[PDB]
RNA sequence: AAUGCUAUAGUA
């Protein structure tokens, strides 16, 4: 997406010659893909575009009558929040074909948000929106969320991101250290010293 | 004011 961003990414690719630099470019490309998907979903769903807002900020957003200092909320950053009919929905954007990666997120959010739900007495429902990049389709974890919007239709294809990722892999396919780094998260360790 | 991965005689 975008032409200036595409040019900046291409300039970053050409000068890149180290495994850590390539890993950083890959991480930023995945983050940009997530940003594209989140912005498009926010535009389609007619809700404000937010990303990783603090939970306590949401608490003061929905009910600005309780003291923020006294309340104790989990430090996770929800991608988005939606308040309707005395129910708060925690929205998390995911761009993967793996249901397991998002059910892990669902369980962690549920076990964390149950304390806040008892303390405030608002039932906190967690929804994870999942899109498969290879074939555009939308999967919703929460039945209530899909009930709120009878149809879920976005028109997005990640052809730009896939081609640049393929170019990056082609440049650094020989680099074994790069292949090790992309396997795990942002925390990178080199080859073992023994 | 500032923002680029390699930024690379003295003190105990």
Q: Which residues pair with A82 in a beta bridge?
A: A89
Residue whose pair of structure tokens reads 């575009």 in the numeric block: A49
Q: Side by side, which strands form the sheet with A124-131?
A: A80-84, A87-94, A124-131, A138-140
* Separation between Cα atoms, residue A66 and residue A59, nearest integer Å: 9
- Which nucleotides in chain B have some atom under 7 angstroms from a protein Cβ? 5-6
- The domain limits of chain A are 3-183
Nucleotide nearest to A18 (CA to C1'): B5
Query: A3-183: which CATH topology?
Result: Restriction Endonuclease (3.40.91)
Q: What is the total residue count of chain A?
A: 194
The coordinates were experimentally obtained by cryo-EM
Cβ-based neighbours of A67, under 8 Å, separated by 6 or more: none
Q: Gap from A22 CA to B11 C1', in Å? A: 40
Residue whose pair of structure tokens reads 């807002």 in the numeric block: A53
Instruction: Measure CA to C1' and name the residue nearest B5.
Output: A21
* Separation between Cα atoms, residue A125 and residue A107, nearest integer Å: 11
- The answer to whether A115 and A124 are in contact (CB under 8 A) is no
């Amino acid at each position: 997406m975008d032409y200036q961003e595409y040019q900046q990414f291409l300039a970053r690719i050409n000068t890149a010659r180290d495994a850590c630099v390539a890993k950083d470019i890959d991480v930023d490309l995945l983050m940009a893909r997530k940003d594209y998907f989140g912005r498009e979903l926010c535009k389609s769903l007619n809700i404000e575009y937010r990303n990783d807002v603090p939970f306590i900020d949401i608490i003061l957003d929905i009910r600005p009558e309780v003291d923020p200092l006294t309340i104790d909320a989990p430090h996770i950053t929800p991608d988005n929040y939606l308040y309707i009919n005395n129910v708060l929905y925690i929205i998390d954007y995911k761009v993967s074909v793996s249901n397991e990666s998002s059910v892990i997120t669902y369980d962690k959010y549920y076990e964390l948000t149950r304390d806040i739900s008892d303390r405030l007495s608002i039932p906190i429902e967690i929804v994870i929106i999942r899109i498969d990049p290879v074939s555009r389709d939308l999967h919703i974890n929460s039945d209530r969320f899909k009930e709120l919007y009878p149809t879920i239709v976005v028109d997005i294809n990640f052809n730009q991101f896939f081609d640049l990722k393929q170019l990056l892999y082609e440049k650094f396919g020989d680099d074994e250290e790069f292949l090790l780094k992309v396997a795990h998260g942002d925390f990178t360790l080199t080859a073992p010293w023994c």
